[PDB]
Enzyme design. Sequence first.
Site, short mmCIF file in Angstrom:
data_model
loop_
_atom_site.label_atom_id
_atom_site.label_comp_id
_atom_site.label_asym_id
_atom_site.label_seq_id
_atom_site.Cartn_x
_atom_site.Cartn_y
_atom_site.Cartn_z
N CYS A 141 40.73 48.06 45.47
CA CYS A 141 40.86 48.74 43.92
C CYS A 141 42.18 49.73 44.31
CB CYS A 141 39.64 49.50 43.84
SG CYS A 141 38.29 48.91 43.32
N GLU A 175 42.89 42.37 44.56
CA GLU A 175 41.78 41.64 44.05
C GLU A 175 41.86 42.03 42.54
OE1 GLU A 175 38.22 43.05 45.91
OE2 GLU A 175 37.16 42.46 44.04
#
Length: 273
Positions: A141, A175
């Site tokens: 993140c 991601e």
Amino acid sequence: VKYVDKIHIGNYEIDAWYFSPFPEDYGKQPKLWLCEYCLKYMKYEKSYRFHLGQCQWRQPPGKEIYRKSNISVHEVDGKDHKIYCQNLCLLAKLFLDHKTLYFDVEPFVFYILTEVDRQGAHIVGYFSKEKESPDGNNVSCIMILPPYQRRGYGRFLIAFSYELSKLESTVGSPEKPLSDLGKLSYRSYWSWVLLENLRDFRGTLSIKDLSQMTSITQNDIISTLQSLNMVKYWKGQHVICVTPKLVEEHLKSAQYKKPPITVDSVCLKWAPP
Ligand SMILES: O=C(NNS(=O)(=O)c1ccccc1)c1cccc(-c2ccccc2)c1
Ligand SMILES: [Zn+2]
């Protein structure tokens, strides 16, 4: 206020964008008050002010792996500093729709970006990264707090994440799913980086060459080059196709004109774990 909807951190009051699962009792107060150095969350202005006079932290924990002038990055392992990392994750979840991990932080390393003055090192944002990513994700993140968004700091952190991948001799990609601001930011970063390389060589840079030089995956180079219309397709293979002049036309666009806070590899201190 039944979920947390407003935080006070440092000198900033910031509205939440999403639910974050701070304990129920904390969501009941009008504001959640966070220590900007240790990230402890507090329910009252009075407990916050008492904590500010007591807390001895003036920077993140872990190791300062980057410092240049008053910009610094600290590397904080989720196993060594569990509480600080859980605090960081619950603060990030206020601005991230898709983050799902807040407590199981030990598989992660966190890279905290701060801007330093005479008072201490003030958090701007961070990214997390799995210690072992089987999927080759070099960011899990990434979050820049609202008052620092769109000011160069996100570009620095994305660059930083590729600087670690370069040192690991590997490619990597964030991601998915990416946040809305993350998508725009990655696309702009990749375009800038590839264009600048296309301007500097001439010059049989293949897509492979670019992936080795930048640590950007082939797929993300390709999707970027498609969006710039710099790729042709021949018997099943994407091939670069661009003129020096076209590369310069792209780079003269307003979007590439803000002066970047650059990552100076001379000031990065880090080797693969
Ligand atoms: O601030 C940013 N980007 N703007 S910038 O000026 O640093 C930049 C980034 C890349 C290219 C040019 C400029 C930025 C970059 C990456 C992630 C986020 C973000 C923040 C909150 C929640 C979710 C994601 C913001
Ligand atoms: Zn504190």
